[PDB]
């Protein structure tokens, strides 16, 4: 198969912002491993000229989520948010980076 082009591993928050601020399309994102919280994943995404950061949460049942809908994998969370906004105030749909 093909590996996922959105997983960037352990990269700083500032480095994700520098990279995403240079993307052209709204929704360009990456998943990175948080340095502030070891073991947590951070979803960094571009909207307008800004770069917003979302913490990938895990509930008591071990399911991943951003708000209320629960997923069995990061892969499913990411794919679901290609057509459902990651934000409750803005319409930010995840779309792959131009590598």
């Amino acid at each position: 198969m093909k590996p996922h082009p959105w997983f960037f591993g352990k990269i700083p928050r500032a480095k994700a912002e520098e990279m995403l601020s240079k993307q052209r399309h709204d929704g360009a994102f990456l998943i990175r491993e948080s340095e502030s919280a070891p073991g947590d994943f951070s979803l960094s995404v571009k909207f307008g000229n800004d770069v917003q950061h979302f913490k990938v949460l895990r509930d008591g049942a071990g399911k991943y989520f951003l708000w209320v809908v629960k997923f069995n994998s990061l892969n499913e969370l990411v794919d679901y948010h290609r057509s459902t906004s990651v934000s409750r105030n803005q319409q930010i749909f995840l779309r792959d980076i131009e590598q």
């Binding site: 950061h53 913490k55 949460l57 951003l66 708000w67 990651v86």
Partner: peptide, 6 residues
């Protein structure tokens, strides 16, 4: 920070 916390 994080838009979704809390």
């Amino acid at each position: 920070x994080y838009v979704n916390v809390x």
